Design a protein around this ligand. Structure first.
Ligand SMILES: O=CCCCC[C@@H]1SC[C@@H]2NC(=O)N[C@@H]21
Lengths: 91, 523, 82, 541, 523
């Protein structure tokens, strides 16, 4: 009510912890700030066969990738490449 | 069979019209003013206090709530403006306490968290009232209560307004004991120091959680002493994040499942944009608008079945649905008459018989004034509605979209009549009577005073009488004045009216609807 | 109130029970009457009603004559102030 | 068989002792001060206002009550000191309203009469609170409500504290509607002008009585009609008219004068078809074995000295007979069974600082009374500072809560009497105002506050001695009383019984010699409602 | 404290007045006519039938009742005139059955005895209706039922009106089964032959008594076969006197004690003689009288607290006491108006709230007729009273002291609204409308018929229309016509009004008073 929710998320890329400030916009998009850069992110999940696909647009750039979240690792498969991101495990 | 086509309310406003342009501009400024003031309140005590709070390893109070509730779930905060300019030289953002309704482990719960950055979490008189209001909401709707306890005790300079009376700090423990006896779970999370009466909150709770070093009820209190030796602690938490994780587990073990007493239909969005309410309503209470326009922009599909449309037309009553829930809507469309009061009394009986929640839209300007109306028992008719509204046991929600003056407030389910929630728009005004009426009335009494006494009383003497009165009523009828004290549950943007009502009615349905018993209807 | 002097005070004067023709008048312009003395007879919707003296006061005046149509709740007799 | 001989409480005090002589002298002065202040409040607005009131043919408000209740029956007035010095320059004797419990046609009823001689009967913020308290008492005990309506409307200069909130003037009509739905009769007698918003009170009543010439009922006054429609109307024509009695039908009974209206009211109550039924066992009444006025010497006015609460009990219970429960365990608290005017009562009274054993003993006792449906009486004398609480005072926190939780959930009638100090959480455990005792009374020597005045002074004398010792600028002993003297004065002023009673925190200040009578009347009224089963929460073992 | 002095109703009538002399003479003749007709009905079948009945060793039906009830106790007989001239050529005194309420072993019971001297005890259609009415009274008031069975079966020539329908002979056994399930004792005393359905009555009873030789349900039935072999008989009696003695013992073992739900005050006689009602009321329904005069002569001490005396004065409502019982009295004093209906509706709610029995005194002449009254919803107001009266759960007793026409009957608790008892004075008239109104209405329809058609319709043609209508309504509105069929529970002498009401209310108090649930009040 009368304010915007900003979520502080932490993700690990290799040995580096990345702090992401995610703001939930009214229209359903997300404003993510990493360090000094801001990104406008919007997307949805759709299923092809048995594989879940993530359709997203970052700062107006649209792309599709296969999303798998197993244990504490996020697997993103795109024709550009594959990236693994680790979700920190609470002590 | 639900395939019947039906008519829909609402009309397209004239966006080019000068009135619409002016009304939109004025209402927009009020909404922007409301937004930026909340932003300041969001910061609590300030940068120095916030930096000190984090330096001790503790989460900020609003970050605690974000982590407690389900991911991405909306949070309905209440009384954001409590304590706004209430005290002469002390700034108490939000009253030093944050209260609201959110979903924890899929269950709607009332969350009451002390803001330690505001005066070290001391309890001001408004702080007690805000907490007591939250407990009243939780009990009436059977919502589990979660207390994020980080407090510094009562504010000694104002002790007489905190300690002694029935609605003073003592009532907080009374409410906890009563809710526990009714199987309304009471969960306390000690995330800081609690002293004197504060120590009772964890002790009076059904289940209790305390942080390893921050919490104190260290040698005298502390998690280790209470967890292992005193036994006051039911769960032991390493840090704030751990405690919030434990709280979610505790709620999941309540063995509670929500059951609905009302029929449900698929939700539909209104057929008109909500932001058009800015142009339609504006900020000038002297101008009048059709309340049906407001209804058309908040109900599912803008579908509305009007009851007694042509009788007592100054009052609008009908059936609709908000987010699938059935609702009976009562809204003012002019001065209250004998026919309007009778029409309202008939409608309220219908809703109570069918167990249909009631929504009131207060925009009043008074009762009909006239010798004939009194001879026909307008007071008798107006009382019929005050008496039906009071006895109704269906959930009641009140929204003040305009003026709220005199006995018209009571008939439209004012604060005194225990509506489950009460909200006000930023353009609302509330007082015993309109500012002008009080000025004019006095301008009769003292014009008489000096005409009858015989010393003449001139027109300039009139505004030395009228201007102070109008200023007082304007200042004390302001929405912020009403909301700073807990008279309403918050000031809401008109574009958010549908969402707030949907969340409020959903929470109110956690309790079973009881049968309504009426008094004697003075025919 | 118990004395029953109040019963005289409850109403100043007799009124017509309903709108109906006056069929009989039993009181002259100045006549001494006692409580229960019939003053007038009125027929309304073919139903006979006989008006009776409320007090023992002498009659100051009569507002209607025989054959007149008297509206409901209209004063029929004036009684001298005592 | 009830022929068993039993022991009795109480001992004969040493009348010659200097302590008794001093204590009697001090307490007597307080009682005399209390009596003469009530005499002044008895006069209401004053001679000029009273003369004007009578000149209109109306009875004085207290004469109305005398004629309404049964001949010679006692009248229990409540909150006589409401509004005492509450407002800076305005004197409002009794808050402008008289409330109490009396017997009408053999039925105990709550009587709420506006005092038209006080500010013309206008409703001050305290006036609303006093009326709301009376309605709360009537509902909790199922007492029919009789409203002797003679009012001038709300006090506009303080409207924000009268109109808007839940416990503001609007709640008065809400209470009437709720009581009516529960078959608690609501009777209104309009014996004077009913102003805008007060016209609802006659209408919301089950049965209504209006006086012929004096009574006027109108939602809008002749001035508002004149302002809104430019029409001039006499008050009698606009409302309270023969129009209200006949044409409008708002009036159920028509009364010639004040005496006639009061006679009609007695008839209305006699037709309620109500008969009182008792849920408790009854035994013949017996007077206490010791004089009540000895309480003056025993108690005194010095809260620092301590006395045995058993002495107070011995002088109010039937025959001074008392069965003590857990006498040797947690001796700082006294619990036992007795009888007052034949009614069974469980008495809980402080005899020192509260300990863990005392709290456990109290919690056990309260469960016993709730199980047997026995009314509970609390005698609060919480001790303040001096030697002080146990220095750890940590164990006490866990134990104290159990008692707060048992006392709150108890459904038996509860009456609280503050015969001494009432400080901090000890107030809550002993059924303070926040815990809805049916009645709450205080003796003229009582003191109530968040903590004792000395403790607040000493605590601050630690914080700022620390403030300047730790900061490094020295803070001397004379700097200490520039800190302590204002605090002690504030707590003494705000803890005074008149300060507490001026606001409605208690139901009245009572002479100790009248304690037995007041308790007897209060418990008798509280028994008009059936005793419900008690449901407890979780006992944190 | 009950020492307050109060005012009393009633005034001394002018015995010398010609109107009083005429009214007394006319009413006295009606009462004398009523008395002598009952004397003839008292004889049942006749001397030959009575002689034959006694020759078999059996007691006469009315002597059985005299011996059954407590010595000297009053007996409230019901529907004495059932079957009076009902059938063209057959005389059926009292319908062939005697029903009433009397005290047996100190307990109020309903006694239903077949009159074997009348058509051999055969069941005529009116006989079934009279018995069913008695059973309805017993169930509504929880009165034990005693059946003195001596019957000859159904009357075959009229079987279609006895056997098939819901309210036909079959319902008698249904009522017995239902009352037994509610612990309302059913006692049958077979003092004669019972065949076909008759045999079910002893079989369906909780306890049963049969006479040695007279009773049959001899070889095929008989007391010995059922008592010793079939087992249908619970007690075996030598003669009628023995059976009645056994019945008193059976009732004494019911383990029942009467409990009162209402407050009681010492009884007081009215301050005026009851026989003065003859002069006050008379037999001319066109003349009007003050119903307060009737009230003053039946209530304890002639004390009456009037409610809303000056509002809707055509209706009188107030509180009084009869034989110590509290009662709320509603009586007509003129044409019903909107104010009168509202006043009645308010009063009925008061009595239901306090659980006060209601007494209705019907002397109606219709509703107010006028364009303005309809525009103001007189029908809406009249319906308010029909709806409140129907839902009231307090005991209701109706006494028709005058006319009872149209919807005014319904509003004043007519037979259709289940009053516990309904009595009529010998001067009463009841019909859909007054005889004159039906005549005048037709005199408009056919005057129109021939004026609009064009053939002239003369004044002599008018009474060839009006005289048959007036005769029909006079004949069918007669009290004996109404009472011959079971529309009321009896025609009572006005001097006996107080006694009958006292007995009736006393019986009605055997059942606990339930809470009243109202429908929607159409404001
Ligand atoms: O506003 C100034 C005084 C005259 C207008 C006030 C109107 S009259 C109709 C309505 N009812 C009230 O009590 N006030 C307004």
């Amino acid at each position: 009510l009368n304010i915007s929710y900003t979520r502080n998320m932490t993700l690990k890329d290799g040995k580096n912890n990345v702090a992401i400030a995610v703001t939930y916009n009214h229209d359903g998009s997300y404003s993510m700030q990493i360090e000094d850069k801001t990104f406008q992110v919007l997307g949805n999940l759709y299923s092809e066969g048995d594989c879940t696909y993530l359709k997203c647009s970052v700062n107006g750039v649209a792309s599709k990738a296969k999303l798998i979240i197993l244990e504490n690792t996020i697997y993103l498969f795109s024709k550009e490449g594959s990236i693994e991101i680790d979700i920190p495990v609470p002590k | 069979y639900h395939g019947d086509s039906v008519a829909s309310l609402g009309t397209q406003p004239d966006l080019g019209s000068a009135l619409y342009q002016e009304n939109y501009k004025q209402m927009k400024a009020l909404v922007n003013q409301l937004h930026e003031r909340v932003e300041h309140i969001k910061l609590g005590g300030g940068e120095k206090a916030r930096a000190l709070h984090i330096s001790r390893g503790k989460l900020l109070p609003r970050e605690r709530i974000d982590n407690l509730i389900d991911p991405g779930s909306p949070f309905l905060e209440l009384s954001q403006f409590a304590g706004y300019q209430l005290y002469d030289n002390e700034e108490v953002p939000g009253g030093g306490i944050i209260t609201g309704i959110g979903r924890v482990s899929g269950v709607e719960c009332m969350i009451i968290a002390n803001d330690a950055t505001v005066k070290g979490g001391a309890y001001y008189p408004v702080t007690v009232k805000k907490q007591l209001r939250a407990q009243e909401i939780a009990m009436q709707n059977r919502l589990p209560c979660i207390y994020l306890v980080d407090s510094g005790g009562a504010y000694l300079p104002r002790q007489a307004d905190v300690f002694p009376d029935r609605d003073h700090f003592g009532r907080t423990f009374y409410n906890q004991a009563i809710m526990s006896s009714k199987n309304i779970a009471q969960i306390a999370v000690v995330m800081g120091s609690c002293t004197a009466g504060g120590a009772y909150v964890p002790a009076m709770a059904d289940e209790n959680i305390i942080v390893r070093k921050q919490g104190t009820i260290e040698d005298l209190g502390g998690a280790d002493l209470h967890c292992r030796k005193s036994g006051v602690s039911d769960h032991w938490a390493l840090d704030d994040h751990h405690a919030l994780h434990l709280t979610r587990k505790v709620v999941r073990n309540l063995n509670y499942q929500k059951k609905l007493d009302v029929t449900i239909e698929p939700s539909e969005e209104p057929l008109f944009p909500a932001d058009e309410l800015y142009g339609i309503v504006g900020a000038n209470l002297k101008r009048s608008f059709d309340v049906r326009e407001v209804i058309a922009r908040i109900v599912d599909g803008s579908r509305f079945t009007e009851f007694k449309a042509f009788y007592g037309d100054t009052l609008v009553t009908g059936f609709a649905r908000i987010f699938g829930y059935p609702v009976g809507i009562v809204g003012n469309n002019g001065v209250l008459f004998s026919e309007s009061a009778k029409k309202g009394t008939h409608f309220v009986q219908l809703c109570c018989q069918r167990n249909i929640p009631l929504l009131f839209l207060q925009n009043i300007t008074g009762f009909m004034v006239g010798r004939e109306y009194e001879a026909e028992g307008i007071a008798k008719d107006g009382a019929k509605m005050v008496a039906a509204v009071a006895c109704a046991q269906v959930p009641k929600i009140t929204l003040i979209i305009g003026g709220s003056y005199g006995a018209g407030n009571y008939g439209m389910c004012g604060r005194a009549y225990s509506p489950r929630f009460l909200y006000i728009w930023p353009n609302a005004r509330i007082s015993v009577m309109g500012g002008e009426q009080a000025a004019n009335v006095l301008a009769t009494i003292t014009k008489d005073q000096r005409a009858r006494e015989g010393k003449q009383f001139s027109s300039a003497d009139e505004a030395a009488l009228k201007e102070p009165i109008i200023k007082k009523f304007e200042e004390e009828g302001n929405p912020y004045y009403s909301s700073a004290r807990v008279w309403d549950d918050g000031i809401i943007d008109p574009a958010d009216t549908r969402l707030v009502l949907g969340l409020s009615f959903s929470a109110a349905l956690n309790a079973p609807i009881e049968k309504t018993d009426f008094g004697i209807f003075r025919m | 109130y118990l004395s029953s002097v109040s019963s005289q005070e409850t109403q100043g004067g007799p009124l017509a029970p309903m709108t109906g023709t006056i069929e009989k008048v039993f009181v002259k312009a100045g006549d001494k009457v006692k409580a229960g003395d019939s003053l007038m007879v009125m027929i309304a919707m073919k139903m006979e009603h006989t008006i009776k003296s409320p007090k023992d006061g002498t009659v100051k005046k009569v507002f209607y004559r025989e054959g007149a149509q008297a509206n409901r709740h209209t004063p029929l007799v004036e009684f001298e102030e005592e």
